[PDB]
Design a protein around this nucleic acid. Structure first.
Ligand SMILES: [Mg+2]
Ligand SMILES: [Mg+2]
Ligand SMILES: [Mg+2]
Ligand SMILES: [Mg+2]
Ligand SMILES: [Mg+2]
Ligand SMILES: [Mg+2]
Ligand SMILES: [Mg+2]
Ligand SMILES: [Mg+2]
Ligand SMILES: [Mg+2]
Ligand SMILES: [Mg+2]
Ligand SMILES: [Mg+2]
Ligand SMILES: [Mg+2]
Ligand SMILES: [Mg+2]
Ligand SMILES: [Mg+2]
Ligand SMILES: [Mg+2]
Ligand SMILES: [Mg+2]
Ligand SMILES: [Mg+2]
Ligand SMILES: [Mg+2]
Ligand SMILES: [Mg+2]
Ligand SMILES: [Mg+2]
Ligand SMILES: [Mg+2]
Ligand SMILES: [Mg+2]
Ligand SMILES: [Mg+2]
Ligand SMILES: [Mg+2]
Ligand SMILES: [Mg+2]
Ligand SMILES: [Mg+2]
Ligand SMILES: [Mg+2]
Ligand SMILES: [Mg+2]
Ligand SMILES: [Mg+2]
Ligand SMILES: [Mg+2]
Ligand SMILES: [Mg+2]
Ligand SMILES: [Mg+2]
Ligand SMILES: [Mg+2]
Ligand SMILES: [Mg+2]
Ligand SMILES: [Mg+2]
Ligand SMILES: [Mg+2]
Ligand SMILES: [Mg+2]
Ligand SMILES: [Mg+2]
Ligand SMILES: [Mg+2]
Ligand SMILES: [Mg+2]
Ligand SMILES: [Mg+2]
Ligand SMILES: [Mg+2]
Ligand SMILES: [Mg+2]
Ligand SMILES: [Mg+2]
Ligand SMILES: [Mg+2]
Ligand SMILES: [Mg+2]
Ligand SMILES: [Mg+2]
Ligand SMILES: [Mg+2]
Ligand SMILES: [Mg+2]
Ligand SMILES: [Mg+2]
Ligand SMILES: [Mg+2]
Ligand SMILES: [Mg+2]
Ligand SMILES: [Mg+2]
Ligand SMILES: [Mg+2]
Ligand SMILES: [Mg+2]
Ligand SMILES: [Mg+2]
Ligand SMILES: [Mg+2]
Ligand SMILES: [Mg+2]
Ligand SMILES: [Mg+2]
Ligand SMILES: [Mg+2]
Ligand SMILES: [Mg+2]
Ligand SMILES: [Mg+2]
Ligand SMILES: [Mg+2]
Ligand SMILES: [Mg+2]
Ligand SMILES: [Mg+2]
Ligand SMILES: [Mg+2]
Ligand SMILES: [Mg+2]
Ligand SMILES: [Mg+2]
Ligand SMILES: [Mg+2]
Ligand SMILES: [Mg+2]
Ligand SMILES: [Mg+2]
Ligand SMILES: [Mg+2]
Ligand SMILES: [Mg+2]
Ligand SMILES: [Mg+2]
Ligand SMILES: [Mg+2]
Ligand SMILES: [Mg+2]
Ligand SMILES: [Mg+2]
Ligand SMILES: [Mg+2]
Ligand SMILES: [Mg+2]
Ligand SMILES: [Mg+2]
Ligand SMILES: [Mg+2]
Ligand SMILES: [Mg+2]
Ligand SMILES: [Mg+2]
Ligand SMILES: [Mg+2]
Ligand SMILES: [Mg+2]
Ligand SMILES: [Mg+2]
Ligand SMILES: [Mg+2]
Ligand SMILES: [Mg+2]
Ligand SMILES: [Mg+2]
Ligand SMILES: [Mg+2]
Ligand SMILES: [Mg+2]
Ligand SMILES: [Mg+2]
Ligand SMILES: [Mg+2]
Ligand SMILES: [Mg+2]
Ligand SMILES: [Mg+2]
Ligand SMILES: [Mg+2]
Ligand SMILES: [Mg+2]
Ligand SMILES: [Mg+2]
Ligand SMILES: [Mg+2]
Ligand SMILES: [Mg+2]
Ligand SMILES: [Mg+2]
Ligand SMILES: [Mg+2]
Ligand SMILES: [Mg+2]
Ligand SMILES: [Mg+2]
Ligand SMILES: [Mg+2]
Ligand SMILES: [Mg+2]
Ligand SMILES: [Mg+2]
Ligand SMILES: [Mg+2]
Ligand SMILES: [Mg+2]
Ligand SMILES: [Mg+2]
Ligand SMILES: [Mg+2]
Ligand SMILES: [Mg+2]
Ligand SMILES: [Mg+2]
Ligand SMILES: [Mg+2]
Ligand SMILES: [Mg+2]
Ligand SMILES: [Mg+2]
Ligand SMILES: [Mg+2]
Ligand SMILES: [Mg+2]
Ligand SMILES: [Mg+2]
Ligand SMILES: [Mg+2]
Ligand SMILES: [Mg+2]
Ligand SMILES: [Mg+2]
Ligand SMILES: [Mg+2]
Ligand SMILES: [Mg+2]
Ligand SMILES: [Mg+2]
Ligand SMILES: [Mg+2]
Ligand SMILES: [Mg+2]
Ligand SMILES: [Mg+2]
Ligand SMILES: [Mg+2]
Ligand SMILES: [Mg+2]
Ligand SMILES: [Mg+2]
Ligand SMILES: [Mg+2]
Ligand SMILES: [Mg+2]
Ligand SMILES: [Mg+2]
Ligand SMILES: [Mg+2]
Ligand SMILES: [Mg+2]
Ligand SMILES: [Mg+2]
Ligand SMILES: [Mg+2]
Ligand SMILES: [Mg+2]
Lengths: 49, 272
RNA sequence: CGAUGUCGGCUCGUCGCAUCCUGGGGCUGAAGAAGGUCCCAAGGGUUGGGCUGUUCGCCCAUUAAAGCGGCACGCGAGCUG
RNA sequence: GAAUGCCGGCAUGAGUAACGAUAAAGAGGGUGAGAAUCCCUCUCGCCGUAAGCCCAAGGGUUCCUACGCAAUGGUCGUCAGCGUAGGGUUAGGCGGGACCUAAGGUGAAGCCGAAAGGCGUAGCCGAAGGGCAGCCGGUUAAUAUUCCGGCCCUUCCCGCAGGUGCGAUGGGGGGACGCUCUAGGCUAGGGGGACCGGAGCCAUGGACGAGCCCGGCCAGAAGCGCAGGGUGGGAGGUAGGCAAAUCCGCCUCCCAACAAGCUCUGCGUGGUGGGGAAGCCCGUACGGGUGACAACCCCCCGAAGCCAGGGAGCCAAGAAAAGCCUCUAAGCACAACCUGCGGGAACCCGUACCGCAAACCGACACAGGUGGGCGGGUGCAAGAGCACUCAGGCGCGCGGGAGAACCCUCGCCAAGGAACUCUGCAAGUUGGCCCCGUAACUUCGGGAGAAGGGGUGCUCCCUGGGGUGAUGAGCCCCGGGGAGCCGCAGUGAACAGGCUCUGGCGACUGUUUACCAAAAACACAGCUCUCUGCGAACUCGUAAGAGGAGGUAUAGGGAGCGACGCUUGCCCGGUGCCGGAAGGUCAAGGGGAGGGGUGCAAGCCCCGAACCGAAGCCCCGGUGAACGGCGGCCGUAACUAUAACGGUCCUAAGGUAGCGAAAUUCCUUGUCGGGUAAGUUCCGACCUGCACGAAAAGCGUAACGACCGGAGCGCUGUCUCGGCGAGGGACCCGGUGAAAUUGAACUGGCCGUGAAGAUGCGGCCUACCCGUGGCAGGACGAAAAGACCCCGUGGAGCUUUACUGCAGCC
RNA sequence: GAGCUAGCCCUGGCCAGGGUGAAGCUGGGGUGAGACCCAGUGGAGGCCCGAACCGGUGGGGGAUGCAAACCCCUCGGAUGA
RNA sequence: UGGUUCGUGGAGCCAUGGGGGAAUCUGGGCGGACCACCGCCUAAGGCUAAGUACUCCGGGUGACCGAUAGCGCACCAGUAC
RNA sequence: CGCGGGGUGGAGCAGCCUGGUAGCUCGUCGGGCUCAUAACCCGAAGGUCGUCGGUUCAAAUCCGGCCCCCGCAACCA
RNA sequence: CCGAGGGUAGGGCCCGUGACUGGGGCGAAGUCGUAACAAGGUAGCUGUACCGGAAGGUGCGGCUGGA
RNA sequence: GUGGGAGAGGGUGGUGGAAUUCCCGGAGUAGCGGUGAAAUGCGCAGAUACCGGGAGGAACGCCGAUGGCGAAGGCAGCCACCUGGUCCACCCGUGACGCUGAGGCGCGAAAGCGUGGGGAGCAAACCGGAUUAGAUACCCGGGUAGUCCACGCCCUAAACG
């Protein structure tokens, strides 16, 4: 059947990107938490040009 | 007149379509004056706030003239009468000698080629606009302003009118389509005649689809729902209500008057 | 009750006997034929259809007879639902 | 030592199940330490509106090559999408960005909000939509519309040359638009040819023949030619297009009424550039040479594509902005802009490869899902259908045998035809086309494919229309009549309704429990009530604000009923809602009669009665397509029987019509009648309606239903009642190799006993040790800390005239 | 968190081939003029048969599956809500 | 209405959102309703070290652990997945 | 089986809960109006209060046991 | 070839019969009421419409077969 | 044909006053309505009676007649428009062109039906209050269709002289 993962580079970027997270206090805290944690990747790596 | 069909299909046996014979050879509209992009959307910034809206034909807005006092004294020739997707009535395309082209909402009896004009001057004829004062008591009228210089707001639906009843210092009394008795300021413009397309009420949609074409989504009964959804939801195999009938939001829907009492508008109203 | 699947049907059965049939027998208000009733006897047999989910039962047409009950109302790690 | 404890390790089932589609394999030769599995050749089979080909998303080295096989591959592996390394992605014209705007997002102005923040006209961001200049070949092992070859373009910048008042983010025009049906001419694509080109070939009885087989094109500037799209030209007047305007708009006169003329596309042609089969020889994994100076011509079918803003009809009335044309304002007119020709300038990012899939989404080389374009040939009425087949791509990454039970899938049957079963569930009969011919009823459309019939191949003769062609031959579609031939059978294979009668419910097409319910449920047009005068009512939000709606009573919100026909009776006592400037009560406040506490007092400080005090409640009416409700007991007619009539008690009023053992009937298989040999169902009645009944609508209704019941016909393996055959497993051999379960085990029957159902206790009976295929009675077999039931002063969801608050409205 | 699913907004795309033959238009008839009736044309429709595509009706298989919704036969819709 | 031990209590003091609304030393607040007395302070403007908190970081010590412990990580771990 | 309502003149109903009196309509019987009947008018009659038991000074009335009558209930399996 | 007739299938008319049901008719002395005939005690009749145990009543309009 | 005459003949539009009912303002009390008699009902929440304004619908007093017109049904304030039938005179024109009339077609009171209006009065049904043995009637107080308009059906009658 159709499963739940339907990859889209634009969606992933607009949805979970560094700039989206930065836009709101909710998201800014996510970066803070991930930084303090020592996460190698703050936001998902969306590729291609 | 109303177009009628034979039952060559079920739902074609009741279906019924407007007569478009008053639609003069001018079916597609007029750029310049109108159209605008019209912005379909069944809801506010976010959430739906009027249920069951959506779908249905794309539209172009015809930006019509609801304040006729710009062109006081300037007459215009009625050039055409065309279909307007965004109202019950039809619209008149008129050419002002000025050059300017406006649309007026098209009254009953309006003929193409006719002369029409607005102002204190203005022969009392179908199509003309006047401040309510100079209009003879008892004449039927439409596109009436509520307060002066604020635009036509009463009687624009197809086949509607108001009748002038009497006067009272600065106000003339109106009898509105609903039957209400209203004091409306003398200085309010209103155009003589009834609205026309009066056979609009006689049309039978005929099937579900037609409803959808006009963007009317299926309306579901409270009875059909559940207690979470509606006061009428549940219980077992059908149910008669079990309380005084209500809206989904709990207010009673048979009888409960809802106009706020202390409206300052009150001292200008005399009926139902 | 940290699970003993619950009606009926189907399939496969097996057992009890307080025997429906057939075998033996006493009494009969048993002439004979056919019955009634009781005793001995389970070796084998104990039909096909209509309605009902039905068990049971009421019918239809037969038959030697169309027996009753136990087996977790026998049998769902065999089927049906 | 126990926690269905936690982590780790190793067992058991077990050499068991399986090895992922039943599209299919055989052989010969290579290479190698090692071949069913790799490379090659011959044969066989499968897809072919794909299982072929090209894009888009996603993927991100998987692409190419050399070297390798420990792991990854459901077996093997010399092979690989795997390991090591090295290569490989070339753009002014293809796509995206130095262009535009949509929803939406952002947001200077502004508004709002405890803070975080929320709205937000302008502007900006935002794309498969708009705009925009490259076509055909050739080369690499791997890239090419990117490199190269030919032919053809677009921008800027700088020149000269010639024109003109040039000139804005501003005015106007255009861009610019729906659905269905379509005309004319074109191309793509295809079929035919006795014509042209070509290696070759006479086979096995015949054929050296208009014999067989193969191929007969592609791009192409200007200029033409055929199609076809766009558009009227002047002169005045002007108050509108938010400054201006010669532009546009409007009024008035002339000339055209036409595509005549200008343009703008498409298509044919075109200077010239390229391609070019079979077969044969070769050594490649694969391609090369020759065939070739290849030929490159004529007919025919013909689009859904092009001309494209084509036309016709319809209602539901079908983006925006820029590019482009124009008009003028600031300004400038030694500027500038337009046109012609030259030279120069022309960046950034993507490009490999997979891509209906072993490279994407499903943990897997997963029988699943995944948007667009092409998708040939014959035959079948047509077609993207179906059977075979081009090109092209595969044989589905474990094999070999055997020929039991049993399972799955399939084929056939004597005789009977539903006796099967909850039920004809399943399977069968039917089946395409043409022609005859079709009932009740009906909303006059339908019912209708009703039902029931016949025809269907090949051959020869005569013969009617068109289409392309000149009015002709041919080529191509539709037809008619007449003789005859063959078989069991002519839509000879494949795709392709079984039919009727009669009830229930729902009118109808629709919709729904993604993953057990598709229905009689939801929706539906339509009907009625009800609120709403517009800063509407209602909804979201603390607000600002937005939806409603750029709508205005023929309109919008809420409720219910649910096409249509005939209809919807009585009760306002209670509850709701509606209407009532009286009255009663009623909080804060007003008011202070009177009293209290302190002071030597002036004073300061407390309570406090009349009386004035709102909505609300009470009170007075109305309102049932508002919440709802719509009786009991005795008697009576000149056969009995029954009760039109009556008495009496109560009510707010006492169930009308129309239905009725029903989706409603307990007693119940009610009671007659009909279908049957037989009928707890079904159908027609009766009415004693436990417990119908009129908008939670009443009784009907043509048509419609993968709904539900009853019946008959046809036909059958459903059954009497089975039998045989096929294939994939099962079984045996080689290869890989799981699982839940498991206190331990050396794990028999009976009759007892035991926590009351014993392999394990007692007695007796039986029984040598160990396996393999099978059947499931049992281990109260596995699986889930029972779903039901109860418990816990456990939890949630729901309701209301439970309590208490809150929003909201007054 | 709406890359599954639900609705709506913006912008594009898809639906082979067959049947049936509404209005309308034309001619004819009819009348004082009509309605109306015949043909012919015409190509309507939540119209019909049926691929794609979208569904998920009945039966069987699958049940440590190919698959945590599949497969086969059969079936509904297929210019529209 | 909040704060304080103070939950309306005899409920003050301190703070306030709403209404009313002064005085400048013979002026005002306070000492638990209120009043008298006797006393204490001097509102409606601001700044002010030190003693106090913490431990990402460096240093010392341990009747603290010793790779199922000790931080999740002694090991390229906030990694693989 | 459970629960709660009811048996009062011939008929249908009050009368109970706050014990002492049995009342209403109809019917019936006698008289009148009428030719006659009904209607109407004037008088009258009629009740072991379901039975058993006692509580009381005293029971239709209060409390028990039975007896018919009526309505409700009987759910989860 | 045709053809009596047989078979199949679907119709049209007619007759017989059918639980139950609608009204009709006739039947010496049954129940209920008083509609009409005298102004029949509400003048009657009427077409239609609704309502009612029954005759019937009422609404609308008409008639002289009444004043 | 020429020339005139009467008429509620028909259709459409417009308009006038009287009267009822409701609304508001005034003034004003203790009852009004209604019947054979009463009651229901309305009225101290301010009725009835009277005055002033407003709205709305329907019907047209006197003229009016025992009258006129029409083919019948039917037709009544006034105005204008559109239109039918009809009679008198003059004896001018055509010149037998005539009568009836199965069927057909058209009209057709009221009631009723469909769709949308409008709704003052009256008023089937229905609800009360009286009357009665009982009244689903006659009387009274309420009151929905309908009565009115438009269009479309219905085709009946003591459509009667
Ligand atoms: Mg525009
Ligand atoms: Mg919002
Ligand atoms: Mg938002
Ligand atoms: Mg609904
Ligand atoms: Mg529900
Ligand atoms: Mg609720
Ligand atoms: Mg129910
Ligand atoms: Mg409810
Ligand atoms: Mg248990
Ligand atoms: Mg257990
Ligand atoms: Mg014995
Ligand atoms: Mg004997
Ligand atoms: Mg059965
Ligand atoms: Mg049993
Ligand atoms: Mg037995
Ligand atoms: Mg038992
Ligand atoms: Mg059992
Ligand atoms: Mg078992
Ligand atoms: Mg079941
Ligand atoms: Mg222990
Ligand atoms: Mg373990
Ligand atoms: Mg095993
Ligand atoms: Mg085995
Ligand atoms: Mg095996
Ligand atoms: Mg790699
Ligand atoms: Mg190699
Ligand atoms: Mg391997
Ligand atoms: Mg490779
Ligand atoms: Mg590699
Ligand atoms: Mg740049
Ligand atoms: Mg941009
Ligand atoms: Mg925008
Ligand atoms: Mg924002
Ligand atoms: Mg932009
Ligand atoms: Mg773009
Ligand atoms: Mg481009
Ligand atoms: Mg390549
Ligand atoms: Mg411009
Ligand atoms: Mg522009
Ligand atoms: Mg030979
Ligand atoms: Mg060319
Ligand atoms: Mg200007
Ligand atoms: Mg070659
Ligand atoms: Mg066009
Ligand atoms: Mg712009
Ligand atoms: Mg210019
Ligand atoms: Mg590339
Ligand atoms: Mg490529
Ligand atoms: Mg594809
Ligand atoms: Mg594989
Ligand atoms: Mg694998
Ligand atoms: Mg796959
Ligand atoms: Mg697909
Ligand atoms: Mg094709
Ligand atoms: Mg073909
Ligand atoms: Mg075909
Ligand atoms: Mg195919
Ligand atoms: Mg395989
Ligand atoms: Mg057989
Ligand atoms: Mg046979
Ligand atoms: Mg048969
Ligand atoms: Mg049977
Ligand atoms: Mg049986
Ligand atoms: Mg059946
Ligand atoms: Mg079947
Ligand atoms: Mg049926
Ligand atoms: Mg049926
Ligand atoms: Mg349905
Ligand atoms: Mg679905
Ligand atoms: Mg489901
Ligand atoms: Mg279905
Ligand atoms: Mg309806
Ligand atoms: Mg708004
Ligand atoms: Mg709006
Ligand atoms: Mg409404
Ligand atoms: Mg409903
Ligand atoms: Mg319903
Ligand atoms: Mg009702
Ligand atoms: Mg009530
Ligand atoms: Mg009341
Ligand atoms: Mg009430
Ligand atoms: Mg009230
Ligand atoms: Mg009050
Ligand atoms: Mg019955
Ligand atoms: Mg019932
Ligand atoms: Mg029978
Ligand atoms: Mg029977
Ligand atoms: Mg019901
Ligand atoms: Mg109801
Ligand atoms: Mg219904
Ligand atoms: Mg359907
Ligand atoms: Mg049968
Ligand atoms: Mg079989
Ligand atoms: Mg086999
Ligand atoms: Mg093996
Ligand atoms: Mg042993
Ligand atoms: Mg035992
Ligand atoms: Mg032992
Ligand atoms: Mg033992
Ligand atoms: Mg076992
Ligand atoms: Mg087994
Ligand atoms: Mg078991
Ligand atoms: Mg178990
Ligand atoms: Mg438990
Ligand atoms: Mg339970
Ligand atoms: Mg408790
Ligand atoms: Mg036609
Ligand atoms: Mg069509
Ligand atoms: Mg369809
Ligand atoms: Mg179909
Ligand atoms: Mg299903
Ligand atoms: Mg406090
Ligand atoms: Mg203070
Ligand atoms: Mg103080
Ligand atoms: Mg102090
Ligand atoms: Mg003190
Ligand atoms: Mg400080
Ligand atoms: Mg550790
Ligand atoms: Mg260690
Ligand atoms: Mg650790
Ligand atoms: Mg007497
Ligand atoms: Mg008969
Ligand atoms: Mg009879
Ligand atoms: Mg009598
Ligand atoms: Mg009489
Ligand atoms: Mg009389
Ligand atoms: Mg009458
Ligand atoms: Mg009456
Ligand atoms: Mg007054
Ligand atoms: Mg005249
Ligand atoms: Mg003469
Ligand atoms: Mg005649
Ligand atoms: Mg009539
Ligand atoms: Mg009438
Ligand atoms: Mg009616
Ligand atoms: Mg009517
Ligand atoms: Mg009245
Ligand atoms: Mg009356
Ligand atoms: Mg009387």
């Amino acid at each position: 059947m159709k499963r739940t993962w339907q990859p889209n580079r634009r969606k992933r970027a607009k949805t979970h990107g560094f700039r989206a997270r930065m836009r709101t206090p909710g998201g800014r805290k996510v970066l803070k938490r991930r930084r303090q944690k020592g996460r190698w990747r703050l936001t998902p790596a969306v590729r291609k040009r | 007149a109303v177009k009628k069909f034979k039952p060559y299909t079920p739902s074609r046996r009741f279906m019924t379509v407007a007569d478009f014979s008053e639609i003069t050879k001018t079916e597609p509209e007029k750029s310049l004056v109108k159209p605008l992009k019209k912005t379909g959307g069944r809801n506010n910034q976010g959430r739906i706030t009027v249920r069951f809206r959506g779908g249905g034909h794309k539209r172009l807005y015809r930006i019509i003239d609801f304040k006729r006092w710009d062109k006081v004294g300037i007459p215009a020739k009625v050039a055409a009468i065309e279909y307007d997707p965004n109202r019950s009535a039809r619209i008149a395309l008129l050419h002002y000698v000025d050059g300017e082209k406006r649309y007026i909402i098209a009254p009953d009896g309006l003929q193409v080629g006719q002369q029409v004009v607005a102002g204190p001057d203005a022969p009392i004829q179908v199509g003309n606009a006047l401040p309510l004062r100079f209009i003879p008591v008892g004449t039927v009228v439409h596109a009436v302003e509520l307060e002066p210089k604020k635009g036509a707001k009463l009687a624009r639906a197809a086949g509607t009118s108001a009748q002038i009843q009497g006067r009272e210092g600065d106000y003339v009394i109106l009898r509105l389509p609903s039957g209400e008795l209203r004091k409306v300021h003398g200085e309010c413009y209103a155009t003589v005649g009834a609205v026309g397309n009066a056979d609009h009420k006689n049309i039978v949609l005929g099937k579900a689809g037609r409803s959808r074409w006009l963007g009317r989504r299926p309306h579901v009964r409270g009875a059909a729902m559940n207690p979470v959804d509606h006061p009428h939801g549940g219980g077992e195999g059908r149910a008669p209500r079990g309380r005084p009938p209500a809206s989904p939001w709990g207010w009673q829907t048979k009888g409960l008057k809802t106009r706020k009492r202390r409206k300052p508008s009150s001292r200008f109203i005399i009926a139902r």
